[PDB]
Amino acid sequence: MIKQAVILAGGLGKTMPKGFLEIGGTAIVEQSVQKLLAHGIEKIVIGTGHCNEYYDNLAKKYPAIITVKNENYANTGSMGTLEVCASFVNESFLLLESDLIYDSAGLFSLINDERKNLILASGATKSGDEVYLEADEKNCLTGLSKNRDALKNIFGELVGITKLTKSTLDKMCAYAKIHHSDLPKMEYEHALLEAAKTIPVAIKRIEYFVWREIDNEDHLEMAVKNIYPHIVENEKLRAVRREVLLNPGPATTTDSVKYAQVSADICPREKAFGDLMQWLCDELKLFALASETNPDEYETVMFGCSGTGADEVMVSSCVPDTGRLLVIDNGSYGARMAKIADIYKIPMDIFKSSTYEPLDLQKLEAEFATKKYTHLACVYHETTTGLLNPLHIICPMAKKYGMVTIVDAVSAYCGMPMDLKSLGIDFMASTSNKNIQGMAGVGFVICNKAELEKTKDYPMRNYYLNLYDQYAYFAKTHQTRFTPPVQTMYALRQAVLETKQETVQKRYERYTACWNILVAAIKKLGLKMLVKEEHQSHFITAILEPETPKYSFEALHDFAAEHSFTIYPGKLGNIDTFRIANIGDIQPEEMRRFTVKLKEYMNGIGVGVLEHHHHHH
Amino acid sequence: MIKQAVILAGGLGKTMPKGFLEIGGTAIVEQSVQKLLAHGIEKIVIGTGHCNEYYDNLAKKYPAIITVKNENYANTGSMGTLEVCASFVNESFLLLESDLIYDSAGLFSLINDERKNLILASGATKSGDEVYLEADEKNCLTGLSKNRDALKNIFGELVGITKLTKSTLDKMCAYAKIHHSDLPKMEYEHALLEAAKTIPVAIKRIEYFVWREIDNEDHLEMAVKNIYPHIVENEKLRAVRREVLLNPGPATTTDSVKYAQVSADICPREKAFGDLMQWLCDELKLFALASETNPDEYETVMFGCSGTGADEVMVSSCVPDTGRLLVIDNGSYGARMAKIADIYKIPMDIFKSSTYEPLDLQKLEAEFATKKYTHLACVYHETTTGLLNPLHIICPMAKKYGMVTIVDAVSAYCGMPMDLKSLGIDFMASTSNKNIQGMAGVGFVICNKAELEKTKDYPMRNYYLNLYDQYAYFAKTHQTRFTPPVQTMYALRQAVLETKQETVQKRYERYTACWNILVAAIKKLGLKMLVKEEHQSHFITAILEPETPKYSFEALHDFAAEHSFTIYPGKLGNIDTFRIANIGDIQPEEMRRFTVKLKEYMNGIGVGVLEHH
Ligand SMILES: [Mg+2]
Ligand SMILES: [Mg+2]
Ligand code: NI
């Protein structure tokens, strides 16, 4: 696993950086950034020079980009840009030139090779400036030249994508500093060749690797006609069938998240995996904390689990027999929390309320005021109807009466901004397969650390789902208690990375745009929403089923499915409904195509239309 | 998801079918079979003709193969072989010719394309006799010829791998029947073109797809010299770094199981996924039942869970307050079952015994005879030391005294033949990341159905891990209570398929061969095994650490990891040990390489003979 990458973009061409020449509508260096992020890169250091503003503006779209300018770019070569970048590199890394177009498989190849220092090379490209590599019995670099008559053998041609350790970069930089006066325009290939004399730098030769440098006009124009369609074909060969899921459970994911599950087998006890788990714990909690909130006041505890499993974790680990829990039940998640508390014989009372209209906050405060209750359990967003409870009022108020707050945010977390501190939330549960847009398998609880340890002496009500034992064992040892869903957690790492890329606020805006399109269509058709828009989460909408016998949920479902849309049925006993969610990787235009299909069906069964009769004496 | 495939192998070229020409050491049809299985194919129908005995022998190595002979293969074309096969095809399927070598990505492409009828085509191959396809603006098939003069356009060249619906095959066979007399040597390409006039058959053109048919003498060696290395390069571009894990946890898996996680997003409530889960239950229970025992007497209940989760499911769902549970504890799994029973306040007693020596079966029988206990909970294989408890004696004996049997087989199931009926096991737990060689995430309990049903009215001790609620909800509705680990379960399906390919008996023999290599090396090194060989499972071995201060677990571990081997520490406080497992996709040659590395380290610290002056 490579976490960091360096893009060299100091040198000159146009009135443009060559990385910003556009193919298929997007600048080529931006496509390089996208492929790198797709393979799990966390930090991309771009060494800029001529026309730096372009890269500085591109960095505003990708938080992973750090632009570092080589101010002496006109008097130096690529190694100067590299040394300028090198202070920002902490680990093994990928080194790329900005003018490349390449099959992303190369990345996958370089990352999946054991050899720590590894140059990517191709077969005969019969291009213009070829960089030829000379290799030994162990396919390690022995020579490098742009003239074939200078090398004892020719193993391949330099692509411009190389995997290097921080130590190799240190040697390259030391050799560069020693020669700043004699060789001020040294290329990085030279420094790597010299470093290869004391450090084995292997070459991985992909004979038919598809790639091209876009520096000139010849390669620029031959790439659009021959090389780039080849790259697009190769990359789409790995594309997965896109199903647009309109259910609030596992939704549509990006293919990069899908492939994050594909990784080397690892023993979960190893320090690398414990590091992955610590990283996940640290990163997941920040999606539920404002920047102003100290992340150290909170912890994350993960389980191989569904979201309801994390709810059971909270309910069965946070309420001692000494206390009494008040459970708010205005939906199926709250009812499930009540049932869990009941099964465990937890001292509890239930506050039942409507599934599609807001809670009576004054009756809620009246019940808070009795001071009977030590703990409050409630739900932020009930997917049964899409009602959004005002926990920013409910939970601080419960805090005012001395209660500990336990919250289901399984279908709210990462879909909307949250700050547990100002929200007055001590324990918050969520899962990996909802608005974080990962794969199902990991449930987790973000805890106020003080409230979490006050749990330390509670008698255990269970084993696998006990919050404090799970947290403490990984605090003592760098390991989890039992085997975690390793591949699910790799996928979750990439989902977290892409959440940091998209931002929670802009993810909310995307969900809301899809919701707006759907609601506009619902209004245009005369269909009725159960929850008024003021109180709706923009994540799922419950729609009243038409009373006509011509309507069938199965018919609408199969019709939508024939066009790659998966709609969700209703769950209420009181009211016949169907549900449309818009989370996951759904795009607004996909919601409009579905909306066109929905209008087609509803008109076809007589909704929004006059019923014309054609009989006549 | 494509479950079926047809390979046409009727005509001749030598004294063997062309599919059995060998490149890279393996017959090309065997490579095709392996690539198909790797992509999740469950049934391969091979239409045979000349020298069918070769394919009949190949079917002995691959349970997925059904060989059906075109008895009139000398008087028919490829469509006759197809008609012979067509009665054995029930769903959408892949149609492949036997003399093909191809980039396996094509399979992945055809399976992941939404279009139901789909011809795979390549760019200009510049070979002999090429089949050119003429397509409309949709890229749908309108023409087919080996003369470019006859086609209004040239969209690509037919590869010989096609995805088809059962209805399209019905149309081709109907058109074939009426023309058995005039056109007895009809090719399948012709019947497909005829069906394509009334059914849209799309063409997917991978312009640079690497493939060749091995038909003449020219192409065979043009392929060994140029095409086949290209295919190998392309496929290794997708290869995952192979780490050989010697821990009993998640071990080394096949890349096919890894990539089975990559699938179209699906809502778990959809009927296709409920069918996948029903299939998983039905197939998973068979790995713990002999052929003679009725699978209807048993059920499988799955949870998003580790193995300890399944243990907790069993103990917290199978023992009522009215009864009394005896837990055998000769290892960490038994201690964990005891701890769970205690946390849930189960009326329970502990039978403690040595972690590395066999249970005293007579003292145990004496405790059974007390008639104090309604339930017995025990472990088949303790990875703490590799001790294998004689459950074939213990559990039938417990049944003889009227007890309900609860068994941890987390590290035994699918590593050795098991039959719950003759073993007297009522509830058996296991996981997805051990001997089945899948990915972690799914725990499951195989239950005697009658004993499972007497659980129906026990008060629930929990919710997520309650056995009967989980089972009943999926019995009633075709759905699970909560969101299951969908992708882990696709990986588990592929793992089940590969277990059916290998068979549990031969997997046991593979594990035991690795264990034999390791034990021979241990003996040659003078190291001591804590458990006697007759009570060892053969899946993991606990080895006493050398007394020399030159030894460090840290050093041995880093040295092994430096060569892609992951060794496991010991678990006892009483005796300092390290552990070597040999499960997962481990191959004997990899075990032999590890033994050489182990010898190197151990010699470097002095476990060789000492003779000097
Ligand atoms: Mg350049
Ligand atoms: Mg053929
Ligand atoms: Ni009328």
Residue numbers in the entry:
A (entry chain C): 1 to 13, 21 to 624
B (entry chain A): 1 to 13, 21 to 620
Paste lines from the article.
Herein we reveal widespread occurrence of nucleotidyltransferase-encoding genes in phosphonate biosynthesis and characterize two representative enzymes as phosphonate-specific cytidylyltransferases from the Gram-positive actinobacterium A. rimae and the Gram-negative spirochete T. denticola. These enzymes efficiently activate AEP, presumably for subsequent capture by carbohydrate or lipid nucleophiles. As predicted from gene annotations, the overall structure of the enzyme included an N-terminal PntC connected to a C-terminal AEPT domain. Structure determination of PntC from T. denticola (Tde-PntC) and molecular dynamics analyses indicate that PntC selectivity for the smaller AEP substrate is primarily driven by active site steric constraints.
In contrast to Ari-PntC, the larger two-domain protein Tde1415 was readily crystallized to afford a 2.72 Å structure of the apo enzyme and a 1.95 Å structure of the product complex obtained in the presence of CTP and AEP substrates. Strikingly, the presence of two adjacent magnesium ions in the Tde-PntC active site contrasts with the single ion observed in the Spn-LicC complex, and each apo-enzyme has one less metal ion. For example, a two-magnesium mechanism is favored for CMP-Kdo synthetase (KdsB), FomD employs two metals for cytidylyl (S)-2-hydroxypropoylphosphonate hydrolysis, DNA polymerases commonly employ a two-metal ion mechanism with evidence for an additional third divalent metal ion41, and terpene synthases require three metal ions. Overall, in contrast to Spn-LicC, which loses a salt bridge between Arg129 and a metal-coordinating residue Glu216, the metal coordination sphere of Tde-PntC does not undergo major changes upon ligand binding.
